[PDB]
């Protein structure tokens, strides 16, 4: 079923750009539709301090929510029972636009470092340029010395990071095919 | 007592953790001499009598860990004490067997990595950079329905 690679790609998200504890406790939601908190509890073994962040990330990122099953307890009195109710749609929306927001920004990345023009005086560390020393060329000089400390100046840029943002994107892209296999996966039945 | 010395003989036989003779194990801690630790121990699971010559077992690989995983789908939560008493050194085998193949809960590494059972399928998924996990958290997911409209905009 769709379901499925809905859930398998919420682990792979989640075991890549989560922790370990994150896909245990997804796995533990995802164990019982309508699963006590309780159970949940005991199958972690852990302290409380360990299981409501996890939670708290699946509730931000979607994939899980809180829902009030109506539980009537057998002791005259008034218990919730703290199911967990998958939110698929919200789910893997939220993570395309995660994945959307970070696919955007590191392309944003790619364009920022590009292209080298402009000095530096390596001395009083005031950047410079091609213009604005040129004027200050003189007819018995090959090098443009400096305004501020009559000293001459050197180049600056590197489009080193440009490569270094190419990378990124690369990665990024590597990172994202099983992600954006699954989404479009799901996007047929849009479930 | 009858509950204390029959445990300390099957804390004596889980230390040896081998088929001992009935004559070794009871002299070995020379507290279980009394046939009620030994009917006790017939009566329980605590250590495996059988009509066969003295062999003390319980009632164990990291195969059996993978069905152990498999067995612990929807279930309770157990430690890794009958892991480490269990096969030991599980902690070696839980990193060699790593993705997934012997799943893991480090809470923290001072405590023997004190794990739970847990099922996976990719389990480790390192492959995913660090800096890609930041600018993941970096970005903030939205509120309701207007999500799905978002990304009809994107295309998504
Ligand atoms: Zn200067």
Known sequence: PIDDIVKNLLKFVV????????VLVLDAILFHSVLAEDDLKQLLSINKTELGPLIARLRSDRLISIHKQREYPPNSKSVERVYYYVKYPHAIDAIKWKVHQVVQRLKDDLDKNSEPNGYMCPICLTKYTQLEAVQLLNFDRTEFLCSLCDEPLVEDDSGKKNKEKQDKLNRLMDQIQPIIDSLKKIDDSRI | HDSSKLLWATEYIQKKGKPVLVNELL????????????????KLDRIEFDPKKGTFKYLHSPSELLKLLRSQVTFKGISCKDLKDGWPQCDETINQLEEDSKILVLRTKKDKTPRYVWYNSGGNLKCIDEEFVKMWENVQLPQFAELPRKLQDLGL
């Open chain 1, 15 to 22: 075991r890549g750009f989560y922790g370990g504890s994150f």
């Open chain 2, 27 to 42: 002299d070995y801690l020379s507290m279980k001499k009394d046939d009620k630790v030994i009917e006790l121990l017939k």
